[PDB]
A paper describes a structure:
[name] acts as the catalytic subunit, but the loss of any of the six subunits results in hypo-modified U34 tRNAs in yeast, indicating that the complete integrity of the complex is important for its function. The enzymatically active [name] subunit of Elongator contains two functional domains, utilizes multiple cofactors, and conducts a unique uridine base modification specifically found only at the wobble base position of tRNAs. The two domains form a cleft that contains several highly conserved basic residues, which bind and accommodate the [name] anticodon stem loop (ASL). The current model of a radical based [name]-mediated cm5-modification reaction is proposed as follows (i) [name] recruits SAM and cleaves it to generate a 5’deoxyadenosine radical (5’-dA) in the rSAM domain, (ii) [name] hydrolyzes acetyl-CoA in the KAT domain and (iii) an acetyl radical is formed by the products of the two domains and (iv) is transferred onto the C5 position of U34 in the bound [name] molecule.
We used full length and truncated versions of purified MinElp3 in crystallization trials and obtained well-diffracting crystals for monomeric MinElp3Δ1–19, MinElp3Δ1–46, and MinElp3Δ1–54. We solved their structures using a poly-alanine model of DmcElp3 via molecular replacement at 1.9 Å, 1.9 Å, and 2.1 Å resolution, respectively. Although all three versions contained various lengths of the N-terminus and also showed no signs of degradation, we could observe interpretable electron density only starting from residue V72 in all collected and refined datasets. The overall structure and domain arrangement and interface between the rSAM and KAT domains of MinElp3 are almost identical to DmcElp3. The main difference relates to the Fe–S cluster loop region (aa 87–123) and the Fe–S cluster itself, which were both completely unstructured in all monomeric MinElp3s. We previously identified a Zn-binding motif in the central linker region between the two domains that is coordinated by three cysteine residues, which are strictly conserved in bacterial and archaeal but missing in eukaryotic Elp3s. In our MinElp3 structures, we could not locate any bound Zn-ions and instead observed the formation of a disulfide bond between C384 and C389. Nevertheless, the equivalent sequence still obtains an almost identical conformation, indicating that zinc might simply contribute structural integrity in anaerobic bacteria. In addition, we observed that the acetyl-CoA blocking loop (aa 466–486) is positioned outside of the acetyl-CoA binding pocket, interacting with the last visible residues of the N-terminus and also contacting a neighboring symmetry mate. Using our DmcElp3-DCA structure as a reference model, we are able to show that acetyl-CoA would also fit seamlessly into the active site of MinElp3, indicating an almost identical ligand coordination and active site organization.
Residue numbers in the entry: 72 to 87, 123 to 534
């Protein structure tokens, strides 16, 4: 069987899910209830806004949609978005993360301002491909230049950046896809924090369906998808987090393409056969290593580790606590020296804490030591202390701004941070 995490994922659908006529409150509440039915904790919630067009909707609609999702978490009505957010800072169901999915050409400064106002902590760009040939071929409404610019504006606003990517699009190839993944992790224009990967599928009613019928598009089968994703994972940097390889599309709607439901497991077994190692965040995090391999961090070998890389014109500092003998990731912090910020509260003497993650409670149903956690052991506070030290003593910055989930602001207050516009900030 699978694993129970301490963070509840609540994914909701915006208007043009079907059962609740896209009501934000009913979707959020129904998902929480459903999770409580099966004994999954719901005190910490990652809210995911699905649709990819949300940032293009009227602001009135966005504010209301997020307000009502928070109302369902707060279990009470609110007069406005801002009040629902204030209430949620101390509610029983805290919004610790808010991910908004969007097309890369709907990611202007104005839209980023609005997303920060909503409390967003992560933005998933519908990149699909980094090659303009492929994008025009499939009549996508964005360029690779859109993706690059959006990525930079997001990073320099302190937000986590996720790329949705599709191997096997029309016009592509196995080698071309492999090159795309190498470029995404070694070209500073890209360097995303997360990637969501799934091979391109043929679903009736899409342009891809039209191309497929014309004989223009033969989608990847399992073998091809496995080869590309296995390569991608073998080269993923330690600072990249991947999504569980899966899809919420039932096999009876897939005209052509990968139908089987265990693509992630197939990739894993292929990587074993070929001796391909995976060092990315999902592969090494405590809960996954315990579920997969039955072992726990060896405290004699837990160290603070640091890895730097150039991204979108600036410097990313990836700090982690890690069992370096067994290569197990316990916690990490993303610190950025920004490049060309535009937000009012970001100086040229400002460092950005874009993310702090301590892997916490986790009920591994398939192991005999069931519950395991690593919060309240000091790793988060030690990562923050190191981040402040690096910011002040190495980069000569004078203030540090934290991108904080609504429901996480209380944590940063305990560490001396105060609200600074959309962020939690501290003078160094």
């Amino acid at each position: 069987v699978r694993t129970i995490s301490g963070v509840a994922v609540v994914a909701v659908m915006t208007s043009p899910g079907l059962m609740f006529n896209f009501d934000p409150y009913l979707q959020t509440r129904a998902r929480i209830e459903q999770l409580e039915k099966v004994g999954h904790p719901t005190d910490k919630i990652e809210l995911i806004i699905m649709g990819g067009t949300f940032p293009a909707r009227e602001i009135e609609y966005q504010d209301w949609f997020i307000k009502r999702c928070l109302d369902a978490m707060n279990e009470r009505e609110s007069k406005s978005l801002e009040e629902a957010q204030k209430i949620n800072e101390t509610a029983k169901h805290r919004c610790v993360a808010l991910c908004i999915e969007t097309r890369p050409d709907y990611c202007s400064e104005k839209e980023i301002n609005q997303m920060l106002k909503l409390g967003a902590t992560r933005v998933e760009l519908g990149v699909q491909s980094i090659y303009n040939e492929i994008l025009k071929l499939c009549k996508r409404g964005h360029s690779v230049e859109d993706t690059i610019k959006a990525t930079q504006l997001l990073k320099d606003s302190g937000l986590k950046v996720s790329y949705h990517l599709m191997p096997g699009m029309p016009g592509s190839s196995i080698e071309m896809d492999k090159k795309m993944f190498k470029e995404i992790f070694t070209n500073p224009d890209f360097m995303p924090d997360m990637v969501k990967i799934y091979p391109c599928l043929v679903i009736e009613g899409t342009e891809l369906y039209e191309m497929w019928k014309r004989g223009e598009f033969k989608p990847y089968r399992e073998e091809e998808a496995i080869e590309v994703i296995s390569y991608a994972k073998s080269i993923m940097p330690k600072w990249v987090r991947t999504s569980r390889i899966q899809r919420d599309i039932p096999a009876t709607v897939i005209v052509d393409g990968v139908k089987k439901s265990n693509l992630g497991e197939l990739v894993y077994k292929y990587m074993e056969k070929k001796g391909l190692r995976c060092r990315c965040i999902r592969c090494r995090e405590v809960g996954h290593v315990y579920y997969k391999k039955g072992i726990l961090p060896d405290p004699e070998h837990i160290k603070l580790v640091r890895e730097d890389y150039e991204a979108s014109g600036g410097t990313e500092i990836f700090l982690s606590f890690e069992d370096v003998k067994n290569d197990i990731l316990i916690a990490f912090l993303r610190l950025r020296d920004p490049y060309k910020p535009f937000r009012k509260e970001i100086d040229d003497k400002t460092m950005l804490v874009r993310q702090l993650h301590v892997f916490g409670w986790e009920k591994a149903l398939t192991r005999d030591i069931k519950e395991v956690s690593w919060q309240h052991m000091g790793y988060g506070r030690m990562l923050m202390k190191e981040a402040e030290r690096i910011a002040k003593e190495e980069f000569g910055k004078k203030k540090i701004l934290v991108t904080s989930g609504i429901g996480v602001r209380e944590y940063y207050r305990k560490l001396g941070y105060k609200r600074v516009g959309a962020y939690m900030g501290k003078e160094l």
